[PDB]
Design brief:
It is built from six helices and no strands. It is 49% helix and 0% strand. By secondary structure, the protein is mostly helical. 18% of the residues are buried. The PDB classes it as motor protein.
Length: 85
């Protein structure tokens, strides 16, 4: 519940996906997500987790905002972000 972006690998060979979260962040860790997508996560989820830190937290904190409840917002940003890539 504590490895960082660099430590926790959750992208495409997501070691954490190997460990709702499973398909949540497989595409939310690609270069697809750029700090404006971070912004969109913070606003549309209505989470101050990403308002305090749009590039600095741990997998615990992203589940802190409920993944299934806020998959609507995160999803819009996710397929958005992949097409943005």
């Amino acid at each position: 519940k504590e490895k960082s972006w660099q430590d926790v690998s959750k992208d495409d060979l997501a070691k954490m996906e190997e460990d709702e979260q499973l398909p949540l962040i497989i595409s939310l860790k690609k270069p697809s997500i750029m700090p404006r997508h971070w912004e969109k996560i913070k606003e549309i989820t209505n989470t101050k987790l990403n308002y305090e830190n749009p590039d600095q937290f741990y997998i615990e904190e992203i589940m802190g905002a409920k993944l299934l409840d806020f998959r609507e917002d995160i999803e819009d940003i996710t397929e958005s972000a992949d097409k943005q890539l």
